Design a protein around this nucleic acid. Structure first.
Ligand code: ZN
Lengths: 140, 138, 70, 54, 98, 141, 119, 189
RNA sequence: ACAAGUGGCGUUCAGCCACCCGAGAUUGAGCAAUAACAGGUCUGUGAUGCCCUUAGAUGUCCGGGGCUGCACGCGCGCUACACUGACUGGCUCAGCGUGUGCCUACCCUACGCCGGCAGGCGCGGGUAACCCGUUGAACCCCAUUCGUGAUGGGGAUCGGGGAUUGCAAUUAUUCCCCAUGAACGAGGAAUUCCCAGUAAGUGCGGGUCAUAAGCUUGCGUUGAUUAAGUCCCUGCCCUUUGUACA
């Protein structure tokens, strides 16, 4: 309960500054593609007790979090959790994390802008996309 | 042997009181086992007020239904007090009933006398009985 | 608010040598004068009851009450 | 006209599948208990059915 | 074991015909268990008053009550035809099953 | 004295029956007890990973109090309040998968049988297994 | 181009039953509940237009009134007027358009480009 | 021997004013076990005064709309706040509530006149029941606004508020506003 | 249950106030006069008067489209701006009512099996105080964690997938899984609503409905502060008064 000598005040893992003063499954939420419902089963399958702060863990279990986190399908995070369950281009089952969800997002946006389907034209013009009224709401 | 109710609201409690070696059981659980415990003294108010010697011949079994939780508590204590007073008027002499009714009424009148207040109906033009909608002018 | 996530080196003599001389010991008591989080307050002030220098006066899910044992 | 496209649209499950049983309108109906009248034809014949204001 | 079942929208004609039927069955002294008062179903339809929706939005509340009773008796099942010939008053209708 | 479930405090008794349903090792634990949400309204998995034994403990207590119940009434007992975002909140029912697997897993250790009316009830053996645990919380004060 | 891991070079040999496993739930729901005579006779005239071209030329323009049709993978190459209520807009179907609706390629309204407020 | 919360004697506490002697109902008839009575008390003029003072105290903590209708939450809050009085000060808490309400009702006040929006106010004095319920309103403000945004929870803040009106420190929003709205009646004279 | 009994006030008359005995000492809604407005409705009408169109129809059908569009206002509402809280487990309680249909396909659902959900599949019950249903409702209660951070509040916008309805869901109908974390930290001049089971908090039925509620209509549950009065404000009625206004 006293700070260890192995206590970390920051982590910078996957190039986002994870603060060492917060709890672990709420420290990892800055990576886009893990939220909390992914996080608590990540620390369920990585076999770590949840109670510790971000600095209290050693580097070996932390790298077990990241290495099991990148391919969760090896370690029985099951198939309905997945972020892209059928890709347009690959067709593999994947859970896409911080910098790859962004690239797949703007490629799907620009693919919609290329082929003259509706939703990317609604995305480009400045409208709500999913059928909303913008007569009264959403004014900037 | 009496069974005499007490009600506050659509919550209805009736105690089954017959002769014995002392008992209080509200639907099979005793009086120290009811869920709200910030209101624990309300059910115990005849036990603290009358004393356990005044209950010393009876077996009281309380069966409740309906209402909320707090209205159910306020029907439990009223049904218990009416149970002991109905037993005391039928089987004990009436000056003991007079003593128990001035010790019970003067503390709180909901122990012996019911609550005539019920929920008044919604009418149109507003979300409750009295409240009305916001009525823009311009 | 910039609070401690775990105890520093000279926080333990403050936790052990100021706090049983306080009149009222709650989890809202130590964190104003210590700049700590309330999780340290709940866990550490629960652990002192096994050191036997406080007495539990009340327990609730929102408010816990301890004091000096005379 | 042709009797394979004229009134070929399904008149199950619609607002045009139901109408007032008196006045041939479809709007503001009262569907409960097999009345199937619109609200105005309820209010004309209301005491004649037995629905009484109390 | 024949149970006669009465239904109406008004209480007074139903009370007269149930009293008359139990008087005709208590004058011949069959075993009759008394009238069992089943709960009343209120058909309520709350419509708006205005035909074009312009005014101060006053609402209209209609209702109709259905009063549902029965008498049950143990007898020969062709003695039972002679009691239901006095019960032909309007309103109340009679359904008989065994 | 004679100690049944109805005479004792119900905050400790379900956790002591959960301690017995952990410590026997004859309650089966299926493969997906550690990744699931427990209805469509809750946000997260349980804090304590011992939720399956606690849920089975309370389920057998509910079969102690009122039998003649099934899965579809076990979801009526175990519903809750759905926060819906910017819409009003709602009451939304509990999961039939957890109740089906808990009640078959409680049938697996010969503690629970079905009712004559198609739903569920206790055995005499499952009656015994709960009154003994009520007898063992009865001395711990 | 490869769609769900399957290019068009191994997609044109599949039946609708093999399409049922890698499409979305909307189109799988549609081929579950099944198609009607209008789209199938449209498919008849689309096949008949696509046979009759010299192999660098397009098919002839077969227009239609159906905005709700699936892109089935055989239709890649076609020039189809899909009726938006005034106009039959010309689609050039490529294999990356498979799985979208036929009314996505006939746009129904104008870009809203405003002036002054009124009184 | 009616004891409040099971533990509080009502036999000994000292109302040191004459004007609130029939308007703080704490003595022997109004000794009740709980701050809940579910009463019919505000149905007539002047039956709300001989509601018990503890029952008015827990009902006036129900005030804002997140916490409307919830009584047992404030029964729990007043229970832990009375235990906070007995641990921090160690005197009978019913003297702390009596001293807070007797000391903090403002004895002079101001009225608006001036024909509805030109401000010239006039000083008059306050009726004692208005002093009692104004004191409970100025004691329930403060503490909720001083535990609105803080790390301090409400029970220590409310019990310290009743302490801070019982001894008269001028951090007390009951005592601070008491002095302010009596001194403006001093000023408009 | 009547201002009936008592005390007081009261031109000793209308009544008003207080208090016992009492379930109860202003429960709430329907109903609604003389007579008028150029109030709304010819879009409820096989109620209609006339004018209009009446076969390259303004009848009538089938098909795509529309009422949903957005440099922008105004109003009804919902959800919140958190520690009385949030999240996770346990515990225990209602009540108004709905339920297989001339026209016509459209229903309440027990229980068992398979899934993490919407659901899939089958035997049953019900035209109702019988079956769903002891309607195991939410808030409230009891312990865990969180610790004042735009944070674990806010869940707006935005991606892939699965199911249901239907002839058909694109301009996502609905639902669930995962991801994303916008102002917002309690709102200024003006103003809306309200007096006891009342405001408010909180859910459940009815309507519309092949799918169904941020609306409306009811039901209950937890349940208060404050007033027991005035004509200052806003409307309105009345009496006296002025007219060349009808
Ligand atoms: Zn009608």
């Amino acid at each position: 309960l006293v700070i260890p000598e192995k206590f970390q005040h920051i982590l910078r893992v996957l190039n986002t500054n994870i603060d060492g003063r917060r709890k672990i499954a709420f420290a990892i939420t800055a990576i886009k593609g893990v939220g909390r419902r992914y996080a608590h089963v990540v620390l369920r399958k990585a076999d770590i007790d949840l109670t510790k702060r971000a600095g209290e863990l050693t580097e070996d279990e932390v790298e077990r979090v990241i290495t099991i986190m990148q391919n969760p399908r090896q370690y029985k995070i099951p198939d309905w959790f997945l972020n892209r369950q059928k890709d347009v281009k690959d067709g593999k089952y994947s859970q896409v994390l911080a910098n790859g969800l962004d690239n797949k997002l703007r490629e799907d946006l620009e693919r919609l802008k290329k082929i003259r389907a509706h939703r990317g034209l609604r995305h480009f013009w400045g409208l709500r996309v999913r059928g909303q009224h913008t007569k009264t709401t959403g004014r900037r | 042997s009496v069974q005499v109710f007490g009600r506050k609201k659509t919550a209805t409690a009736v105690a089954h009181c017959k002769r014995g070696n002392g008992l209080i059981k509200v639907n099979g659980r005793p009086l120290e086992m009811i869920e709200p415990r910030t209101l624990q003294y309300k059910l115990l108010e005849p036990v603290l007020l009358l004393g356990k010697e005044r209950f010393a011949g009876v077996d009281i079994r309380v069966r409740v239904k309906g209402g909320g939780h707090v209205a159910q508590i306020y029907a439990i204590r009223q049904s218990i007090s009416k149970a002991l007073v109905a037993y005391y008027q039928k089987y004990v002499d009436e000056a003991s009933k007079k003593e128990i009714k001035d010790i019970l009424i003067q503390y709180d009148r909901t122990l012996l006398v019911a609550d005539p207040r019920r929920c008044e109906s919604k009418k149109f033009g507003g979300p409750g009985a009295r409240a009305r909608y916001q009525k823009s002018y311009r | 608010l910039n609070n401690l996530v775990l105890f520093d080196k000279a926080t333990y003599d403050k936790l052990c040598k100021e706090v049983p001389n306080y009149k009222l010991i709650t989890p809202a008591v130590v964190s104003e004068r210590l700049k700590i989080r309330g999780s340290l307050a709940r866990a550490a002030l629960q652990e002192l009851l096994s050191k036997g220098l406080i007495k539990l006066v009340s327990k609730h899910r929102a408010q816990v009450i301890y004091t000096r044992n005379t | 006209g042709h009797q394979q496209l004229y009134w070929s649209h399904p008149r199950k499950f619609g607002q045009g599948s139901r109408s007032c049983r008196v006045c041939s309108n479809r709007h503001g109906l009262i569907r409960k208990y097999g009345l199937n009248m619109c609200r105005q034809c309820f209010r004309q014949y209301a005491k004649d059915i037995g629905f009484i204001k109390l | 074991r024949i149970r006669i079942t009465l239904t109406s929208r008004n209480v007074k004609s139903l009370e007269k015909v149930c009293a008359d039927l139990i008087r005709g069955a208590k004058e011949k002294n069959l075993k009759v268990k008394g009238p069992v008062r089943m709960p009343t179903k209120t058909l309520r339809i709350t419509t708006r008053k205005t035909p074009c929706g312009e005014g101060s939005k006053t609402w209209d509340r209609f209702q109709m009550r259905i009063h549902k009773r029965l008498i049950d008796l143990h007898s020969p099942s062709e003695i039972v035809k002679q009691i239901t010939s006095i019960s032909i008053e309007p309103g109340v209708e009679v359904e008989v099953t065994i | 004295p004679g100690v049944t479930v109805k005479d004792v405090n119900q905050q400790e008794f379900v956790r002591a029956l959960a301690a017995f349903l952990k410590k026997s090792g004859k309650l089966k634990v299926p493969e997906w007890v550690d990744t699931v949400k427990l209805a469509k309204h809750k946000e997260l998995a349980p804090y304590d990973e011992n939720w399956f034994y606690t849920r089975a403990a309370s389920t057998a207590r509910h079969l102690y109090l009122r039998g003649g119940a099934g899965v579809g009434s076990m979801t009526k007992i175990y519903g809750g309040r759905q926060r819906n975002g910017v819409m009003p909140s709602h009451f939304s029912r509990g999961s039939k998968s957890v109740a089906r697997r808990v009640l078959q897993a409680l049938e697996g250790l010969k503690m629970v049988e079905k009712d004559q009316d198609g739903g569920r009830k206790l055995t005499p053996q499952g009656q015994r297994d709960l009154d003994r645990i009520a007898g063992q919380v009865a001395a711990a004060n | 181009f490869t769609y769900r891991g399957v290019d068009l070079d191994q997609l044109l040999d599949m039946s609708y039953e093999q399409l049922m496993q890698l499409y979305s739930a909307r189109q799988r729901r549609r081929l579950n509940r099944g198609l009607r005579r209008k789209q199938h006779s449209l498919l008849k005239r689309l096949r008949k237009a696509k046979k009759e071209a010299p192999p660098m030329e397009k098919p002839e323009v077969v227009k239609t009134h159906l905005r709700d049709m699936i892109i089935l993978p055989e239709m890649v190459g076609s020039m189809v007027g899909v009726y938006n209520g005034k106009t039959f807009n010309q689609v050039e179907i490529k294999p990356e358009m498979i799985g979208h609706y036929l009314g996505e390629f006939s746009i129904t309204y104008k870009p809203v480009k405003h002036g002054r407020p009124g009184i | 021997d009616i004891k409040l919360f099971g533990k509080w004697s009502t036999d000994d506490v000292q109302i040191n004013d004459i004007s609130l002697q029939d308007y703080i109902a704490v003595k022997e008839k109004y000794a009740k076990y709980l701050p809940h009575s579910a009463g019919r008390y505000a149905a007539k003029r002047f039956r709300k005064a001989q509601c018990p003072i503890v029952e008015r105290l827990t009902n006036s903590m129900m005030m804002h709309g997140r916490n409307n209708g919830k009584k047992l939450m404030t029964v729990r809050i007043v229970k832990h706040a009375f235990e906070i009085i007995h641990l921090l000060t160690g005197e009978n808490p019913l003297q702390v509530l009596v001293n807070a309400i007797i000391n903090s009702g403002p004895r002079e006040d101001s009225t608006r006149i001036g024909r509805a929006g030109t401000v010239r106010r006039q000083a008059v004095d306050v009726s004692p029941l208005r002093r009692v319920n104004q004191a409970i309103w100025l004691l329930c403000t403060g503490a909720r606004e001083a535990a609105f945004r803080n790390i301090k929870t409400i029970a220590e803040c409310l019990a310290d508020e009743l302490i801070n009106a019982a001894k008269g420190s001028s951090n007390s929003y009951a005592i601070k506003k008491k002095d302010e709205l009596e001194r403006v009646a001093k000023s408009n004279r």
